[PDB]
Amino acid sequence: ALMNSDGLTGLSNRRHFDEYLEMEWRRSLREQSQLSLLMIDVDYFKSYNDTFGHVAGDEALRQVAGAIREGCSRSSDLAARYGGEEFAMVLPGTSPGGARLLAEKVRRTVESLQISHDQPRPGSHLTVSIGVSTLVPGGGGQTFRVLIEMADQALYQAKNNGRNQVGLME
Numbered sequence: 001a002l003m004n005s006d007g008l009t010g011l012s013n014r015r016h017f018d019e020y021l022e023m024e025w026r027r028s029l030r031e032q033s034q035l036s037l038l039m040i041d042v043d044y045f046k047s048y049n050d051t052f053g054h055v056a057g058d059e060a061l062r063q064v065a066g067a068i069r070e071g072c073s074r075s076s077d078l079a080a081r082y083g084g085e086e087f088a089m090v091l092p093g094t095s096p097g098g099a100r101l102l103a104e105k106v107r108r109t110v111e112s113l114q115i116s117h118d119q120p121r122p123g124s125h126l127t128v129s130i131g132v133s134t135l136v137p138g139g140g141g142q143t144f145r146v147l148i149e150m151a152d153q154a155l156y157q158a159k160n161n162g163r164n165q166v167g168l169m170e
Helices: 015-029 045-052 054-071 096-112 147-159
Strands: 035-042 078-083 086-092 126-135 164-166
Touching: 015 035, 015 054, 015 078, 015 086, 035 045, 035 096, 045 054, 045 078, 054 078, 054 086, 054 096, 054 126, 054 147, 086 096, 096 126, 126 147, 147 164
Parallel strands: 126 164
Antiparallel strands: 035 086, 035 126, 078 086
């Protein structure tokens, strides 16, 4: 077993990520500071594995992890593979605008890989959709997972508005 990382990509694993996110949520709750989150998801990944095989798939995920840690400039940022082709990045102290720009950096860096795909049509390249959320944590029964929920809602927006794009929550 691995304690903090993902075997395939070498990024953080889900458990390590969730724990960090909860600490940062609570930090932001006490500071009343903005906490942003990216949920990043390879487009047409099912088709991709079916057509090119799980080895090709794994190599693609590895390259995407590379794109992702590249966007992971600042020490306080943390990137994980949440599961399958789903990744996550926490961005403490990051405004909606800053979160969105960084997601665009990641999105473009993924396109720069030029990984050939035949979706949405022959001659295409691998892309990611990204949901961005940001919140100043509040009172009552509101856990850190609301931030994930918001990003996942943003992710649906991006996925249903044509993919290869960033969705936004607020």
